[PDB]
RNA sequence: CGCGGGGUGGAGCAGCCUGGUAGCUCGUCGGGCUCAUAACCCGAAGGUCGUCGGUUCAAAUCCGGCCCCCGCAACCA
RNA sequence: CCGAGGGUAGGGCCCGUGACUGGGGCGAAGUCGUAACAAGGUAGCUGUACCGGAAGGUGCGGCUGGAU
RNA sequence: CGAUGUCGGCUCGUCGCAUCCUGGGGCUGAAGAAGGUCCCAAGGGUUGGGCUGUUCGCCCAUUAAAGCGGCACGCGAGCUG
RNA sequence: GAAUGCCGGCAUGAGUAACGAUAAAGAGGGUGAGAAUCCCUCUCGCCGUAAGCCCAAGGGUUCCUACGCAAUGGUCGUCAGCGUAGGGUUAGGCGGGACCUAAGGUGAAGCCGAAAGGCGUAGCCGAAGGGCAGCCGGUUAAUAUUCCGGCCCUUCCCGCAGGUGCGAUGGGGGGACGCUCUAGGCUAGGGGGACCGGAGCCAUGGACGAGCCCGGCCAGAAGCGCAGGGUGGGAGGUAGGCAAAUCCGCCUCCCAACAAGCUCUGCGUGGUGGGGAAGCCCGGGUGACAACCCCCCGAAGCCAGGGAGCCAAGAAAAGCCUCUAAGCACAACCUGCGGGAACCCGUACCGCAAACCGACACAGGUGGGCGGGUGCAAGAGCACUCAGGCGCGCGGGAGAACCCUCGCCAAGGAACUCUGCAAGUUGGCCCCGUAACUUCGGGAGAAGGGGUGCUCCCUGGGGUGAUGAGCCCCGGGGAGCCGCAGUGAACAGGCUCUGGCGACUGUUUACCAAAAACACAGCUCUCUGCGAACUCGUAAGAGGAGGUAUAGGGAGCGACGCUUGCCCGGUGCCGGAAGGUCAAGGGGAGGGGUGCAAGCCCCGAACCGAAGCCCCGGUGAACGGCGGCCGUAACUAUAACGGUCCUAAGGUAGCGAAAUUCCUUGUCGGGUAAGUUCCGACCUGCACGAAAAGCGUAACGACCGGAGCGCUGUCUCGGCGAGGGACCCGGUGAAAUUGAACUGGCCGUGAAGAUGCGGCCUACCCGUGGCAGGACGAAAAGACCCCGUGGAGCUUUACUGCAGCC
RNA sequence: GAGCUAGCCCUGGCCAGGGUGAAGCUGGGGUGAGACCCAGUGGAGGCCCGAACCGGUGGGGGAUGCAAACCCCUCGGAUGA
RNA sequence: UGGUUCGUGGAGCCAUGGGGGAAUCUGGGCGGACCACCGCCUAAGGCUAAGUACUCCGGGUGACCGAUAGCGCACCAGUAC
């Protein structure tokens, strides 16, 4: 599961 | 699915066997170490 | 006379095959074949040392007579011309009046039923082997030994030849298939005529699978790789070379000369190759 | 008030660095050649150097402010 | 059953029209050069080919409808 | 920063009023009809589509009207991606 | 007392989720302390190219039987792959070894390496490849090609007889080979029979019948028959097959040659030996003296080392046959016959799975053979069924929301949405018919349409047989009948127009990317004369290649079409016996230390002195790069034209708001009621452009864009219905999380978002089914960001080394 | 450690059925001879449709799973690299 | 080049991969570049107890542990897994 990206 | 362990008696004996170990400087050190540690089995069991 | 096909598949549109017209015997001489051990380009370490090799059709090696000074003076009849998968040339089966049989590379124009002979006194006819000194200047020749008694080394591929340009001392001057001008010792044997099957170079493989049949695995460009792999590897998007074009091992590959400088054979090479 | 370069006869460019000197090509003006125009030949005129202020005995030139004209940058989110 | 015709679908020919585009004709006094007519100042013309703001230039071969 | 998931949409609402409509008004350069402007008023209502991820906006067809803002740019242990 | 500390114990969540494919169960009888769950019987359902049967791996007693049920079994348990005990695996012919060799491994000779060790021809090892002698039936609770029975066969030893120049690890032959297609004749297997054998049956309206139902074979030596495979015979010469050779090879001659002859298989027959159903009665008995026969279909199997065609050109060695050498010809070998001899290991059971690989009795993974019948054009597809095997090791009710999988839907028909995502539609076969474009193959199943069942009658060809009948395979014509509907169920394309990209079939990030990426034929440059270049290795030795410039390495580009312009000043590479610089070394002008001196010792200029660098040239499908300002035409505008500065040279053709355009939804045109997307144009191209190729291109694509038709529950806009869950009762019973808790709302306050502080409001105690706003809810010591004189991968004209090369 | 995975080497095995109909061959036409055209025969192909087998396109489910990558529907290849 | 305290240092000594290459006591090496003087020692063959190190094994002894300690193991442990 791709981690959430706060980028 | 296809897992990694796919047993094969001939493969086992020719790869980890007593005679494979003895043929080689590192393999003899394996035997030397497992004797010093007191292993009941110096080499993997395979029925042949 | 390379053969074409009608475009009934996308690959048959371009494929061409050799016409096999000169061939007169479709199975080899059992006593003259032996197994050709395929390598896949791997050396005695098991390491790939020539990339992209393997997986081609199984072949039997045909023993070829590259000496012919072996049987001086003994004539032979040309029994057949056969396909050989181990080389581009066709090959000729010889029946010596001895009863001995042998294969040679089939020169252009050689005819089934004619005779051939080797030696210092042989006539100057297509298919005959003489020492180089006894062959007249101007003669087109193939299967040339490069040193006496060491075996034919030069001009062996389909269609090739050398031409005798002149003499000097114990040596004759040859123009090799590459155009190089070279001194070859006069006692070196050579065979009169050019190698045959000269249409070989016009075959169009036509499809990727054909290269696979020949044992040629796909070749991948350095520019398609990563910096771990290759000087041309990496870059965002496509990328030019960005440095002098190089091999996988980093040496330059556009012009950089590679013949060893102090090689003894330089005293015997008159003029480097042409075109 | 992110960064850089530029402004000097009519046009396009030197001179600045290294203070005291304004230069080159074309254009323009007078004359000549030709029936005549152009080309060509012989002469000449025209720039106080974007502006202000300072330094200096002296500023196109060195330093600062302003005006204008280009060019570059603006990423991680 | 055939059957005017209606419907569905796919073709053929012709006309009109279309952002834009190609060249053509014509138009008293526009800009550039001067290719041709004199050996027109490199004889011209010519089929082809390549090139050039433009007429044109050059290569190859051909013609005299070229002069001296 | 030993983690407060970050745009838009969908769903579901709820609130403020600087009010888009409907209701009540004063002034008008309000004849009538229709407007303009300001005051009171938040009870209810405030459409369907083309384009774009879009918020917004432009356009089509309507409408009494096609309001503007807050709720972690409301709402991912509710969905979407 | 804290370290997301360590080890152990025990809580919470909670009687909660779950109990592992939605193939499915019901009853009667029995056993037992106890039974939905074990046994038996009837009924029902599921698989049936398997979910049945047989091998090989792997597993290792799980096999069979008696006794058991604490634990294991997701419930239960009397049952079990579980516990205890006893029993069980039988070979000259099956498989492997006392036979052969393959890759590869090992390795006398030999080569190399500080040591360890690395190589290496022969030879040896190495098999699911070669070679080699057993078929059918019976028997056990459990093994059987193994025991037994019947009929066959192999090697070794010895002997007798006959024959022969006998004799080998040496010579030779043979063994011995691909892919696709395929002939004849057979077998396996299957269908039908009004014929043969059989316990019986007549029901509920009819049938005592050419009725129904069941079965109608298997193995076999010599001999014979059919069909195939393999093979020329004789003589003369002979210098080749590393000795010899009567063999083999070559040459010559004569004969035999779509033959024959000899030889070897397959199939049939065959003395004989077996088997033998339904049904009924109790695995057995009976049937039964069972019958065992005709017709058809027919292999991918057999004859086989068969035939043809093609290019990519298709193992070895032994067995075997032949030749001869030492030798020996009292021997020896060949043939026949007789007697004797014949060892070791495996054999149980599971084996697409509860016994193997996945921690589990796990919806996953696991190679080879058999795999029946009917219909559907065919088939291993699909539906139903045989043999055989199962109902998936928790159940009983209920008939809420909600979820999953499924069915239908009025009117509308993409209005849904990023997107027709999803789901409809279409759907097989036969006939009719079919566009642009095109590389002439194709595009094409283009599109679009018609037919499709059953009955009677006439009739065509092919196979079998006989040339007939019967059987069998493809049809053709006419007349009818029925329904809403005839590929009536199941399996089975939605279509079109138009752009971008990539020519194409292929390949890829095992497990978030399948693509426009990689590869690809093809094009070009460049290196390489062979002990090649290049690659791996300290080396020896290998690969390259048993190849040789039409070949091999490296690099870019990427079918094909039309093309690929200008710059060589910088970097690269290539060429250049001059010159400049240049290390060790040579040289030794000239000094110095010390010694009484002979001397010993040290420093040292000119000059000679490689590669490299400088220098001079060449070179672009080498790295790369391809301009600015100002002015000018008789309307305006715009500039073909001119001026000047600069450059190594100033972007040619083609293309262009683009997979590239910032301003931008550029502007105009098309399509739409309306179009930031799309398509066609324009060109002030922020920032295309010619092998990091430019512009096109038929065909191709689970790629990405835009449109239309068809059709729809996508939507207006939801409704109903099915089953598996959810819910209730009986059985078994987790989890992350958790400082403790007696845990409300508002308005404030507080480290700035309060159940916990203030003030006020509200509120009896405790659950069950639900929803997710909050507990800055769980999970993971933020993967973004910074910081650390932290780490790692990668680059280069950063530094400094090293290999390698000069 | 290559019993997973990647490549190569050796030796074996597997790919139902249907469709399209290249070359060649034969014959006919054609010509001075030809090229060539027509028909029949033929059975080619990184050809077509589709099981096994090999894949993993789109969606849904699953997410303390049946499963540390599975299931359903759909979809690619299927004589070949 | 290594060794030594000696990292090129005035760098000797001891060892030696490369080149060159003697002499037999009036021969040769050393005393930290080198020279003289003065001294020390006899290279290019080999052997040699004891005093020294260790603890698999045996014993003796602890202001050593006392079953989460002490060895990983007090127990059928280098076992189960
Ligand atoms: K970042
Ligand atoms: Mg795998
Ligand atoms: Mg698999
Ligand atoms: Mg395996
Ligand atoms: Mg094995
Ligand atoms: Mg095995
Ligand atoms: Mg193995
Ligand atoms: Mg090994
Ligand atoms: Mg071994
Ligand atoms: Mg050792
Ligand atoms: Mg033991
Ligand atoms: Mg071991
Ligand atoms: Mg072709
Ligand atoms: Mg063609
Ligand atoms: Mg040929
Ligand atoms: Mg051989
Ligand atoms: Mg080797
Ligand atoms: Mg290579
Ligand atoms: Mg290779
Ligand atoms: Mg070759
Ligand atoms: Mg050949
Ligand atoms: Mg020579
Ligand atoms: Mg080629
Ligand atoms: Mg090949
Ligand atoms: Mg290639
Ligand atoms: Mg490539
Ligand atoms: Mg790359
Ligand atoms: Mg890459
Ligand atoms: Mg690597
Ligand atoms: Mg690199
Ligand atoms: Mg690069
Ligand atoms: Mg790249
Ligand atoms: Mg780029
Ligand atoms: Mg890349
Ligand atoms: Mg690019
Ligand atoms: Mg490039
Ligand atoms: Mg570059
Ligand atoms: Mg380079
Ligand atoms: Mg030589
Ligand atoms: Mg050369
Ligand atoms: Mg400031
Ligand atoms: Mg200056
Ligand atoms: Mg000055
Ligand atoms: Mg001036
Ligand atoms: Mg001045
Ligand atoms: Mg930046
Ligand atoms: Mg009508
Ligand atoms: Mg002219
Ligand atoms: Mg003129
Ligand atoms: Mg002129
Ligand atoms: Mg002229
Ligand atoms: Mg010119
Ligand atoms: Mg934070
Ligand atoms: Mg935490
Ligand atoms: Mg957290
Ligand atoms: Mg919606
Ligand atoms: Mg209101
Ligand atoms: Mg919008
Ligand atoms: Mg916003
Ligand atoms: Mg907007
Ligand atoms: Mg109104
Ligand atoms: Mg708002
Ligand atoms: Mg905000
Ligand atoms: Mg914001
Ligand atoms: Mg939100
Ligand atoms: Mg979410
Ligand atoms: Mg959201
Ligand atoms: Mg949340
Ligand atoms: Mg929530
Ligand atoms: Mg939350
Ligand atoms: Mg504390
Ligand atoms: Mg914890
Ligand atoms: Mg800790
Ligand atoms: Mg702990
Ligand atoms: Mg305990
Ligand atoms: Mg614990
Ligand atoms: Mg506990
Ligand atoms: Mg408690
Ligand atoms: Mg509890
Ligand atoms: Mg709960
Ligand atoms: Mg659960
Ligand atoms: Mg569960
Ligand atoms: Mg299922
Ligand atoms: Mg029951
Ligand atoms: Mg029970
Ligand atoms: Mg019970
Ligand atoms: Mg039972
Ligand atoms: Mg019953
Ligand atoms: Mg096991
Ligand atoms: Mg029990
Ligand atoms: Mg007990
Ligand atoms: Mg249990
Ligand atoms: Mg279980
Ligand atoms: Mg009991
Ligand atoms: Mg048993
Ligand atoms: Mg037996
Ligand atoms: Mg024996
Ligand atoms: Mg070694
Ligand atoms: Mg072995
Ligand atoms: Mg074998
Ligand atoms: Mg056997
Ligand atoms: Mg038998
Ligand atoms: Mg039997
Ligand atoms: Mg052969
Ligand atoms: Mg062979
Ligand atoms: Mg074989
Ligand atoms: Mg082939
Ligand atoms: Mg039979
Ligand atoms: Mg049948
Ligand atoms: Mg002879
Ligand atoms: Mg001779
Ligand atoms: Mg046979
Ligand atoms: Mg019986
Ligand atoms: Mg009886
Ligand atoms: Mg088969
Ligand atoms: Mg066969
Ligand atoms: Mg061999
Ligand atoms: Mg005798
Ligand atoms: Mg005999
Ligand atoms: Mg024995
Ligand atoms: Mg045994
Ligand atoms: Mg057995
Ligand atoms: Mg399976
Ligand atoms: Mg199987
Ligand atoms: Mg089982
Ligand atoms: Mg595991
Ligand atoms: Mg189970
Ligand atoms: Mg399973
Ligand atoms: Mg049957
Ligand atoms: Mg069918
Ligand atoms: Mg069940
Ligand atoms: Mg099942
Ligand atoms: Mg209920
Ligand atoms: Mg289901
Ligand atoms: Mg249903
Ligand atoms: Mg209905
Ligand atoms: Mg409806
Ligand atoms: Mg519609
Ligand atoms: Mg409609
Ligand atoms: Mg999408
Ligand atoms: Mg259908
Ligand atoms: Mg069309
Ligand atoms: Mg057409
Ligand atoms: Mg079209
Ligand atoms: Mg087209
Ligand atoms: Mg066509
Ligand atoms: Mg009909
Ligand atoms: Mg009917
Ligand atoms: Mg289809
Ligand atoms: Mg592609
Ligand atoms: Mg691609
Ligand atoms: Mg392309
Ligand atoms: Mg293309
Ligand atoms: Mg394919
Ligand atoms: Mg992936
Ligand atoms: Mg990945
Ligand atoms: Mg992974
Ligand atoms: Mg993983
Ligand atoms: Mg995926
Ligand atoms: Mg991708
Ligand atoms: Mg794909
Ligand atoms: Mg890729
Ligand atoms: Mg391609
Ligand atoms: Mg070494
Ligand atoms: Mg090789
Ligand atoms: Mg070789
Ligand atoms: Mg190309
Ligand atoms: Mg490519
Ligand atoms: Mg391509
Ligand atoms: Mg074209
Ligand atoms: Mg250059
Ligand atoms: Mg140059
Ligand atoms: Mg250059
Ligand atoms: Mg030099
Ligand atoms: Mg550059
Ligand atoms: Mg440059
Ligand atoms: Mg140009
Ligand atoms: Mg051009
Ligand atoms: Mg544009
Ligand atoms: Mg536009
Ligand atoms: Mg474009
Ligand atoms: Mg651009
Ligand atoms: Mg734009
Ligand atoms: Mg934009
Ligand atoms: Mg617009
Ligand atoms: Mg429009
Ligand atoms: Mg524009
Ligand atoms: Mg195209
Ligand atoms: Mg196309
Ligand atoms: Mg594709
Ligand atoms: Mg695709
Ligand atoms: Mg559409
Ligand atoms: Mg719905
Ligand atoms: Mg229900
Ligand atoms: Mg109750
Ligand atoms: Mg309970
Ligand atoms: Mg339990
Ligand atoms: Mg408390
Ligand atoms: Mg409390
Ligand atoms: Mg509470
Ligand atoms: Mg409360
Ligand atoms: Mg504060
Ligand atoms: Mg605050
Ligand atoms: Mg508060
Ligand atoms: Mg409270
Ligand atoms: Mg408190
Ligand atoms: Mg309190
Ligand atoms: Mg307080
Ligand atoms: Mg309080
Ligand atoms: Mg309070
Ligand atoms: Mg309250
Ligand atoms: Mg509750
Ligand atoms: Mg409850
Ligand atoms: Mg609840
Ligand atoms: Mg909540
Ligand atoms: Mg919350
Ligand atoms: Mg928190
Ligand atoms: Mg929260
Ligand atoms: Mg996580
Ligand atoms: Mg940490
Ligand atoms: Mg942190
Ligand atoms: Mg972290
Ligand atoms: Mg930061
Ligand atoms: Mg630092
Ligand atoms: Mg620091
Ligand atoms: Mg650091
Ligand atoms: Mg690092
Ligand atoms: Mg090199
Ligand atoms: Mg493997
Ligand atoms: Mg293996
Ligand atoms: Mg296939
Ligand atoms: Mg045909
Ligand atoms: Mg033909
Ligand atoms: Mg033929
Ligand atoms: Mg295909
Ligand atoms: Mg098809
Ligand atoms: Mg779907
Ligand atoms: Mg998962
Ligand atoms: Mg699945
Ligand atoms: Mg499916
Ligand atoms: Mg197929
Ligand atoms: Mg297919
Ligand atoms: Mg094939
Ligand atoms: Mg030292
Ligand atoms: Mg020293
Ligand atoms: Mg030395
Ligand atoms: Mg002395
Ligand atoms: Mg002396
Ligand atoms: Mg000494
Ligand atoms: Mg001393
Ligand atoms: Mg001394
Ligand atoms: Mg001494
Ligand atoms: Mg002593
Ligand atoms: Mg004590
Ligand atoms: Mg104590
Ligand atoms: Mg204890
Ligand atoms: Mg303790
Ligand atoms: Mg101990
Ligand atoms: Mg312990
Ligand atoms: Mg312990
Ligand atoms: Mg134990």
Cα–Cα distance, C20 to C44 (Å, whole number):
37
- Give the 3-state DSSP-derived string for chain C, with helices as H, strands as E and coil as C: CCECCCCCCCCCCCCCECCCCCCCCCCCCHHHEEECCCCCCECCCCCECCCCECCCCCCEEECECCCCHHHCCCCEEEEEEECCCCCCCCEEEEEECCCCEEEEECECCCCCCCEECECCCCCCCCCCEEEHHHCCCCCEEECEECCCCCCEEECCCCCCCEEEEEEECCEEEEECCCCCEEEEECCCEEEECCECCHHHHHCCCCCHHHHHHCCECCCCCHHHCCCCCCCCCCCCCCCCCCCCCECCCCCECCCCCCCCCCCHHHHHEEECCCC
HSE on the CB side for C169, CA within 13 Å? 6
Q: Are C105 and C143 in contact (CB under 8 A)?
A: yes
CA dist C188 to C32, C183, C223, C257, Å?
25, 11, 46, 29
- Cα Rg, chain A, nearest whole Å: 6
Q: Closest nucleotide to B39's CA, by C1' atom?
A: I78
User: Within 7 A of a protein CB, which nucleotides of strand F?
Assistant: 3, 5-6
Quick check: B37 CB within 7 A of strand I?
Answer: yes
Quick check: C112 CB within 7 A of strand G?
Answer: no
How far, in Å, is the CA of C171 from the C1' of nucleotide D53?
A: 94
Residue B29: strand, helix, or coil = helix
β-pairing, C144-145 with C171-175? unpaired
Q: Are C205 and C117 in contact (CB under 8 A)?
A: no
Give distance in angstroms: CA of A1 to centre of ligand 74.
29
How far, in Å, is the CA of B29 from the C1' of nucleotide I58?
A: 30
Q: Are C126 and C109 in contact (CB under 8 A)?
A: yes
Cα–Cα distance, C136 to C50 (Å, whole number):
41
How far, in Å, is the CA of B47 from the C1' of nucleotide D64?
A: 98
C-beta within 7 A of nucleic chain G, residues 23-62 of C: 23, 26-28, 30-31, 33-37, 39, 41-53, 56-61
Residue C41's nearest CA partner among C217, C224, C212 is C217
Residue C188's nearest CA partner among C222, C155, C219 is C155
Query: Which residues lie closer than 8 Å to C32 by C-beta, 6 or more apart?
Result: C62, C63, C101, C102, C103
Query: Which residues lie closer than 8 Å to C136 by C-beta, 6 or more apart?
Result: C124, C164
| H or E element at residue B12 | helix B9-16
β-pairing, C269-271 with C189-192? unpaired
How far, in Å, is the CA of C30 from the C1' of nucleotide G328?
A: 37
Q: Are C139 and C191 in contact (CB under 8 A)?
A: no
Q: Both tokens of residue C182?
A: 């070279």
Q: Are C180 and C269 in contact (CB under 8 A)?
A: yes
Cα–Cα distance, C154 to C131 (Å, whole number):
14
Give distance in angstroms: CA of B48 to centre of ligand 101.
21
Q: Both tokens of residue B26?
A: 């590192």
How far, in Å, is the CA of C275 from the C1' of nucleotide E58?
A: 30
b/e map C87-111, b = 16+ CB within 10 Å? bbbbbbbbbbeeeeebbbbbbbebe
| H or E element at residue B34 | helix B25-36
């Amino acid at each position: 599961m791709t981690h959430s990206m706060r980028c | 699915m296809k897992r990694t362990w796919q047993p094969n008696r001939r493969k086992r004996a020719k790869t980890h066997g007593f005679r494979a170990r003895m043929r080689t400087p590192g393999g003899r050190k394996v035997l030397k170490r497992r004797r010093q540690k007191g292993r009941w089995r110096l080499t993997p069991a395979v029925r042949k | 006379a390379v053969k074409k096909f009608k475009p009934y598949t996308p690959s048959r549109r371009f494929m061409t095959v050799a016409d096999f017209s000169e061939i007169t015997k479709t199975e080899p001489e059992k006593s003259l074949v032996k197994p050709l051990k395929k390598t896949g380009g791997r050396n005695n370490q098991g390491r790939i040392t020539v990339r992209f090799r393997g997986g081609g059709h199984k072949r039997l090696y045909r023993i070829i007579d590259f000496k012919r000074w072996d049987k001086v003076g003994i004539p032979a009849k040309v029994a057949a011309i056969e396909y050989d998968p181990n080389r581009s040339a066709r090959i000729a089966l010889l029946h010596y009046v001895d009863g001995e049989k042998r294969y040679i590379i089939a020169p252009d124009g050689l005819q089934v039923g004619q005779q051939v002979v080797a030696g210092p006194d042989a006539p100057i006819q297509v298919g005959n082997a003489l020492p180089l000194r006894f062959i007249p200047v101007g003669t087109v020749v193939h299967a040339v030994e490069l040193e006496p008694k060491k075996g034919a080394k030069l001009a062996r591929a389909a269609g090739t030849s050398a031409q005798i340009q002149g003499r000097e001392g114990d040596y004759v001057i040859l123009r090799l298939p590459s155009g190089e001008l070279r001194k070859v010792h006069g006692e070196c044997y050579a065979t009169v005529g050019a190698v045959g099957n000269a249409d070989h170079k016009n075959i169009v493989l036509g499809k990727a699978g054909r290269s696979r049949w020949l044992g040629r695995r796909p070749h991948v460009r350095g520019a398609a790789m990563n910096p771990v792999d290759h000087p041309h590897g990496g870059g965002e998007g496509r990328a030019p070379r960005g440095r002098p074009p190089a091999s996988p091992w980093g040496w330059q590959t556009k012009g950089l000369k590679t013949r060893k400088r102090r090689k003894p054979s330089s005293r015997f090479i008159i003029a480097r190759r042409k075109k």
